[PDB]
Write a protein that binds this DNA or RNA. Structure first.
Ligand SMILES: [Zn+2]
Lengths: 81, 151, 129, 155, 87, 184
RNA sequence: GUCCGACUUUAUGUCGCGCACUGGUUUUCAACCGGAUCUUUCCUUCUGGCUAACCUGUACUCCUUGUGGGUGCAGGCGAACC
C-alpha cells in the first residue's frame, strides 16, 4: 500500500494471481511430451485438451476430458515440455 | 461481462501469450500445417472444430502464429469457406431445435421466451453480416429457409 | 463498455490521489491518455509514468507525486471558440492564477495557455489543477 | 432514361433548332449538339454518343447550370427521369452547445446519360426552375457502388 | 505568494506531509510529528541534532502510516532492510 | 563472384564483406547448399562509442527467413573474420510515410509500410537468437522518451556483451534511445 | 548613446530608478511562434510561360593574385510568380 513496484512485482505474486490480472496476459497452460504404452510414437499433448485423444498411429485413449485439465488415461508417461 | 441474454458478469476467457512468432521448440513448418488444415476442412469440419483439433492433437497453438494467417481466411484462400459462418449456423440449428420443441408441445411459454431471445441474436448477426458484405443483403430469415439450409 | 478511455483513466487517477495511492493503473492506455499525460508531467503536476505493451492497447502505470489535487474530463467535447476558452477557465480552474484546462486542437492536445499564445482553438478535453 | 427507343410518346424529340440534313450525302444519323457545364465538371461519355433528348439535361438539354453546388445522397429513384436526394447535416442549437442531424430532401433531374441506384452519393447543381419540386439537377455520380464493386469470392 | 514589490506577504508557509506529500492542517488535531535522534558512531545520544518527519494524520486515519514510516526510514539511509519498493 | 551478390558496387567496404561471405562459401560440405542465394543491399557501417564498431548488412526482406534460419554460424564466422566487428542482419526497408489530408489518396498505405512496423520488426530482429519478452516506455520530466526493452533471460548467453552496440545502432537508426533490462 | 531624479535663480564630475528613448541579439541566455530543411520523410504534379534566378557555360573580364564581383547566350533549379 501507498507504494508498489507493480511494474516489477514479486514473481510469486503474479504466480498467485490468475489470468488477465497480470501485467501481461500470461497463460498458465503448457505442453507435455508423452510416451504411449503401446507404441514408442512420441507425441505432444496440450495441458488442458478436451478431445479424448488416441494416438494417430494406433487407437488407444491417452487423455480424457474434464472441466479443467483433461485426465490422462493412466497408462502413458509424461515429461515437461 | 456484458452478456445480453442474462445477468452474467463472468470474464472467464482465454488470454493469448506475448509471442506472435512460433515457439522455439516447435518442429513443423507452415506449409505442412496448411495442408493438414485443408485436409481437415475437406472432411467437412467447422473451422472452430479444426482449431481445437490442431491445438489438441498437435502443437498448433495459433493458426495465425504458425501459418501467418487465421483459419477462416485461409479457408477462403483455397475457395472452400462455407456459405454461412459456423457461428450463425450453430445458432440457426439451436433455433430449429427450439422450434421443433415448441411445435411438439405448446405450454412451454418460457421456451417462447428463449425463442424470442435467440431469434433476436440471429437478427443482430444478420444485420452485422449484411453490413460487412459477407452475406448478400437479399438474405432474410423466418423459419423455413432455416429448415432447408440446416436440414 | 469503456466509452471514454481518458475519462476512466483520470477517474482512477483522482480516486487514488484522494486515497493517497502514490501510483495508478490505467487499463485502456490510448494515445490521447498518453499525450494528456505528457501535458500533465510538463506542467509539473505528476511524476514519471510507464507504458506496458500487451499487443492490445497496452497499460499505464502513473506515479503520483501528490502535487495533483484533481484531474477531470469533459466527456462532451464541447466545441469552443478562441474567446470562449477563458469562460471555461472561470468555470473549471480554481483561480485565474494557475490551473490548466486541456483542449485538443488541430495542433494537438495542449494546455489552454499554449493554445492562446498559439492563437489556435480546437475542442475541449479536460482540466488539471 | 426514357427506356429503349426514346422516340416513344405522341410527339417527336429533337434538340430544338438543330437541323438534321437530308441533303447531305453522308447518312450521318443525327447532329447531337453537346457542351460542357464547367466548374471542373467533366461531361460523361454516354452523353455525347447518346440518342435521347432530355430537354432538361444540363449537357444535351436546354437548361443552363449556375449558382449553388451541393453534395448529397440518392434516397429515391422510383420517379421517372428524375431523382430525390437526401441531405443530412448538423444544426447547432445554441441553448445546449450541440449539433443536430436533420435531413432535407430535394428533387433533381437526371439525364439518361447516368445510372443511379438508391443510396448513391451525387454532386448536384443549381439550375432554372424545372418543376415545383425540381430546381436542382444532377451532374455526376462518384460513389457508383459504395462497397459493391467486388461481390464474388473466386480466388 | 509574492508581492509586486517582491515580498513574501503570505503568512505561514505550510508544512508538507513527509509521507503523502500533502499540506498539514492547523485545526486537525491528528497531525503527528516524529523526532528521530541521530546516533553517533559509538552509541550515545546526540541531543540538539536530530532529524524530523512530519506525517499528516490522514495516514493515521486510513491506517497505513506504518508502511510510510518504514519507507522513509529505509530510503533515508537510517534503517536497514525493513521496507520494500516491491511488495 | 562478387558482382552478383551486391547489385551495385560503390564503397569497397561492402565488397570486402562480400569477400568474407565468399570465404564462408569456401567451406562447402555443410556451409553450402543454402549460401548460394545470399545477396547484399548497400551495406552500411555503424559507429559505436568506445572505439568498437557494429556492421549493418541489409536484406531485401525476400528470403530473410533463410538467413535467420542459418544465421548464427554466419554471425559468429563474420565476427571471427572481421575482428572487433559486430554484424547486424537488418531487414532493409522501403518505408512509406502517412497519407496527409492535403496529399491525394495514393493507394492507401498498408500498415506493414509504417514507422511503427519497421521499428518494431527491426528491434525484434536486432537480437535474433532470443525473442524480446516485453516492451515498456517512460517519459522523463525534461520531456524525453525512453523505450525500455525486456528480453528473455533464457538464451541470453549468445550475446551477453553487445547490448551497448544495440543501443548505439538503434539510437543512430532513429534517435529513439534504448536501454535494455533482463528479468531473472 | 540620449540623457532623467538627488542640487536651490543656470549648468556639470558625484550619488540614484542600474536605461525613464532608441540597437548589436552568438552575452553565454531561456523561450516560444513559424520557415527551411536529412530523415527509408510529399508540402499533388504535370503541360507550357519567364525563366525568377546562377550548377549554368560562353569572351572571361570592369578589377590587387584573390570569387572582393557581372553584361552575356543552346543544355539545364522552376517554385519567385503564371
Ligand atoms: Zn500409437
Amino acid at each position: 500500500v501507498l507504494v508498489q513496484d507493480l511494474l516489477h512485482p514479486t514473481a510469486a505474486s503474479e504466480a498467485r494471481k490468475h489470468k488477465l490480472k497480470t501485467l501481461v496476459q500470461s497463460p498458465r497452460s503448457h505442453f507435455l511430451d508423452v510416451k504411449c504404452p503401446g507404441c514408442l510414437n512420441i507425441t505432444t499433448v496440450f495441458s488442458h485438451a478436451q478431445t479424448a485423444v488416441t494416438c494417430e498411429s494406433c487407437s488407444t485413449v491417452l487423455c480424457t476430458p474434464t472441466g479443467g485439465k483433461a485426465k490422462l488415461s493412466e497408462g502413458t508417461s509424461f515429461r515437461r515440455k | 461481462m456484458g452478456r445480453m441474454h442474462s445477468k452474467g458478469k463472468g470474464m472467464s476467457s482465454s488470454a493469448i501469450p506475448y509471442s506472435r512468432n512460433a515457439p522455439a521448440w516447435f518442429k513443423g513448418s507452415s506449409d505442412g500445417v496448411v495442408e493438414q488444415i485443408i485436409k481437415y476442412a475437406r472432411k467437412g469440419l467447422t473451422p472452430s472444430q479444426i482449431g481445437v483439433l490442431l491445438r489438441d492433437a498437435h502443437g498448433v497453438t495459433q493458426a495465425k502464429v504458425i501459418t501467418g494467417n487465421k483459419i477462416l481466411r485461409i479457408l477462403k484462400s483455397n475457395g472452400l469457406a462455407p456459405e454461412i459462418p459456423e457461428d450463425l449456423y450453430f445458432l440457426i440449428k439451436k433455433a430449429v431445435s427450439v422450434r421443433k420443441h415448441l411445435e411438439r408441445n405448446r405450454k412451454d411459454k418460457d421456451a417462447k421466451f428463449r425463442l424470442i431471445l435467440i431469434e433476436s441474436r440471429i437478427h443482430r448477426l444478420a444485420r452485422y453480416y449484411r453490413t460487412v458484405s459477407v452475406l448478400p443483403p437479399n438474405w432474410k430469415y423466418e423459419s423455413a429457409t432455416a429448415s432447408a439450409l440446416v436440414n | 463498455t469503456r466509452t471514454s478511455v481518458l475519462a476512466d483513466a483520470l477517474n482512477a487517477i483522482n480516486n487514488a490521489e484522494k486515497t493517497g495511492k502514490r501510483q495508478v493503473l490505467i487499463r485502456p492506455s490510448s494515445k490521447v491518455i498518453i499525450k494528456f499525460l505528457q501535458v500533465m508531467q510538463k506542467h509539473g503536476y505528476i511524476g514519471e509514468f510507464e507504458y506496458i505493451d500487451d499487443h492490445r492497447s497496452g497499460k499505464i502505470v502513473v506515479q503520483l507525486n501528490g502535487r495533483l489535487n484533481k484531474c477531470g474530463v469533459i466527456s462532451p467535447r464541447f466545441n469552443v471558440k478562441i474567446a470562449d476558452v477563458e469562460k471555461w477557465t472561470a468555470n473549471l480552474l480554481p483561480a485565474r492564477q494557475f490551473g490548466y484546462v486541456i483542449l485538443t486542437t488541430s495542433a494537438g492536445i495542449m494546455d489552454h495557455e499554449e493554445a492562446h499564445r498559439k492563437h489556435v482553438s480546437g475542442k475541449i478535453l479536460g482540466f488539471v489543477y | 432514361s426514357t427506356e429503349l427507343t426514346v422516340q416513344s410518346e405522341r410527339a417527336f424529340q429533337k434538340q430544338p433548332h438543330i437541323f438534321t440534313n437530308p441533303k447531305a450525302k453522308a447518312n450521318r444519323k443525327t447532329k447531337r449538339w453537346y457542351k460542357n457545364v464547367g466548374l471542373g465538371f467533366k461531361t460523361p461519355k454516354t452523353a455525347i454518343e447518346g440518342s435521347y433528348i432530355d430537354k432538361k439535361c444540363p449537357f444535351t438539354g436546354l437548361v443552363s447550370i449556375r449558382g449553388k453546388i451541393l453534395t448529397g445522397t440518392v434516397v429515391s429513384t422510383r420517379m421517372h427521369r428524375t431523382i430525390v436526394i437526401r441531405r443530412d447535416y448538423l444544426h447547432y442549437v445554441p441553448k445546449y452547445n450541440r449539433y443536430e442531424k436533420r435531413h432535407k430532401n430535394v428533387p433533381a433531374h437526371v439525364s439518361p446519360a447516368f445510372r443511379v441506384q438508391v443510396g448513391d452519393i451525387v454532386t448536384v447543381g443549381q439550375c432554372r426552375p424545372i418543376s415545383k419540386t425540381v430546381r436542382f439537377n444532377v451532374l455526376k455520380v462518384a460513389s457508383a457502388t459504395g462497397k459493391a464493386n467486388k461481390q464474388f469470392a473466386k480466388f | 505568494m509574492e508581492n509586486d514589490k517582491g515580498q513574501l506577504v503570505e503568512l505561514y508557509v505550510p508544512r508538507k506531509c513527509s509521507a503523502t506529500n500533502r499540506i498539514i492542517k492547523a485545526k486537525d488535531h491528528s497531525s503527528v510529528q516524529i523526532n528521530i535522534a541521530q546516533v553517533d558512531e559509538e552509541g550515545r545520544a546526540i541531543p540538539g541534532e536530530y532529524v524530523t518527519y512530519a506525517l499528516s494524520g490522514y495516514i493515521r486515519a486510513r491506517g497505513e502510516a506504518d508502511d510510510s514510516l518504514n519507507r522513509l526510514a529505509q530510503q533515508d539511509g537510517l534503517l536497514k532492510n525493513v521496507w520494500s519498493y516491491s511488495r | 563472384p562478387q558482382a552478383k551478390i551486391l547489385s551495385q558496387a560503390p564503397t569497397e567496404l561492402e565488397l570486402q564483406v562480400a569477400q568474407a561471405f565468399i570465404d564462408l562459401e569456401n567451406n562447402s560440405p555443410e556451409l553450402k547448399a543454402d549460401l548460394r542465394a545470399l545477396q547484399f543491399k548497400s551495406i552500411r557501417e555503424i559507429e559505436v562509442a568506445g572505439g568498437k564498431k557494429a556492421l549493418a548488412v541489409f536484406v531485401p526482406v525476400p528470403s530473410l527467413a533463410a538467413y535467420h534460419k542459418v544465421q548464427i554460424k554466419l554471425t559468429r564466422e563474420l565476427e571471427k573474420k572481421f575482428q572487433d566487428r559486430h554484424v547486424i542482419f537488418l531487414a532493409e526497408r522501403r518505408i512509406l510515410p502517412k497519407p496527409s489530408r492535403k496529399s491525394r489518396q495514393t493507394q492507401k498505405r498498408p500498415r506493414s509500410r509504417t514507422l511503427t512496423a519497421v521499428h518494431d520488426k527491426i528491434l525484434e530482429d536486432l537480437v535474433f537468437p532470443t525473442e524480446i519478452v516485453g516492451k515498456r516506455v517512460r517519459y522523463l520530466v525534461g520531456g524525453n522518451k525512453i523505450q525500455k526493452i525486456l528480453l528473455n533471460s533464457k538464451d541470453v548467453q549468445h550475446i551477453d556483451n553487445k547490448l551497448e552496440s544495440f543501443q548505439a545502432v538503434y539510437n543512430k537508426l532513429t534517435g529513439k534511445q534504448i536501454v535494455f533490462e533482463i528479468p531473472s
